[PDB]
């Protein structure tokens, strides 16, 4: 249920629907698509938790 | 109760004031009310106090 | 000594380019017709790397 | 094996990952995983986890 | 040396300073009785 | 300061670095006069023997 | 369970002897007429080695 | 700036001498006929003390 990935490589957002990610940051996963494209909620310090799409091959998952 | 939490995955803090901890760790909560709504919380572990993403730990009552 | 500051996030589209995060400081080295500058990135910890970037992702600073 | 031990003499840890504790302290054992068979053990006390020389404690009882 | 543009430090251990400030190199440096780090380009 | 020889830190709070490294000095003259200085390199801060630099 | 703590630095003068640094803990095994004890050294990382040392370089600890 | 590193443990046989533990760094000051050097010991916490030691208990480091 609580599925959580970590940013492995830098990704600047190519649209208004997408997150823009810096290596290290943690993402709570919400949806996954056919493309290789996931929706997630970004846990980054300071900024309010924003919710958007990103290419999945710029993150690594973490397992309990 | 409203006091401790168990860490589900291990975390390594980026800043100076972030709380590094290993997996399974029991952490004492100090603030979980509000810190600018950025899904971080604050707590003590191993005699170091800091902040950490609230996503990474699970609750445990009583 | 010409020096710009990163105004918006830019991920590098090639091996010749810098990859920038808002706040960071760049020493400028060359400027081109495209809208494309070469610079040396002053970022904490990493060795000073030297590359190209779209100039409309930075703001200059004047003495 | 055995869950707890009482500290016969007080100890002060040299490294960061060593466990400082006072005399008489009840400590919860976690590992006797011979590291390099150096005769330390690992345990929790006061919500700080670490390692300590196994020679300073005894199995708890009365 | 002398600071050409004013800077504000991000971390705890970075040196905030105003423009024109004289800083004693210890980068490395003290100013107003606070020691810290700063981009040498400034 | 530029590192003349490479160093590997013993403790947790010591600064490991390679040879030639540019390090930004953070302090000097400890409470105890020990010869170690403090600095940042590669986004890790720590202390190092001042005899290894410049 | 008799246990001493190193009070002063002692480098080993032979192959039969421990070499000690202040702070370290020794479990005592034998004591001799000379002022010379055998002990097992509890030091972090190294395997527990067992050897002789001048007793006036350690302090005992009592329960 | 000549700088050696301690290769083997040495306990001091007199008041004029350093006590050395493997790993420690020594700034070299004088070198003698005996095989005996003066140096300043850079060790963490203690004030930098200055004394004599057998040279065959250290290794030099070259730039």
Author numbering:
A (entry chain D): 2 to 65
B (entry chain C), D (entry chain A): 2 to 63
C (entry chain H), G (entry chain B), H (entry chain F): 3 to 65
E (entry chain E): 6 to 31, 42 to 57
F (entry chain G): 6 to 59
Share the article's original sentences:
Here, we show that the protein FCHSD2 is a major activator of actin polymerization during CME. FCHSD2 is recruited to endocytic pits by the scaffold protein intersectin via an unusual SH3-SH3 interaction. When bound to the membrane, FCHSD2 activates actin polymerization by a mechanism that combines oligomerization and recruitment of N-WASP to PI(4,5)P2, thus promoting pit maturation.
The fourth SH3 domain of ITSN1 (SH3d) could pull down FCHSD2 SH3-2. Isothermal titration calorimetry (ITC) revealed a 248 nM (±75 nM) affinity (Kd) with a ∼1:1 stoichiometry. SH3 domains generally bind short proline-rich sequences rather than mediate domain-domain interactions. To understand how this unusual SH3-SH3 interaction occurs, we solved the crystal structure of the FCHSD2 SH3-2/ITSN1 SH3d complex at 3.4 Å. The structure revealed tandem binding between the SH3 domains with the canonical proline-binding interface of FCHSD2 SH3-2 interacting with the surface opposite to the proline-binding interface of ITSN1 SH3d. The domains form an extensive contact surface composed largely of hydrophobic residues and a few charge interactions. Double mutants on FCHSD2 SH3-2 (Y576S+F607S or V622K+L623K) were required to abolish the interaction to ITSN1 SH3d. On the other hand, single residue mutations on ITSN1 SH3d (I1078S, I1078K, R1119A, or R1119E) could abolish the interaction with FCHSD2 SH3-2. Additionally, mutation of residues located on crystal contacts (FCHSD2 SH3-2 N613 and D583; ITSN1 SH3d T1086) did not show any effect on binding. In agreement with the interface from the crystal structure, wild-type ITSN1 SH3d could efficiently recruit FCHSD2 to the mitochondria while the interface mutant ITSN1 SH3d R1119E could not.
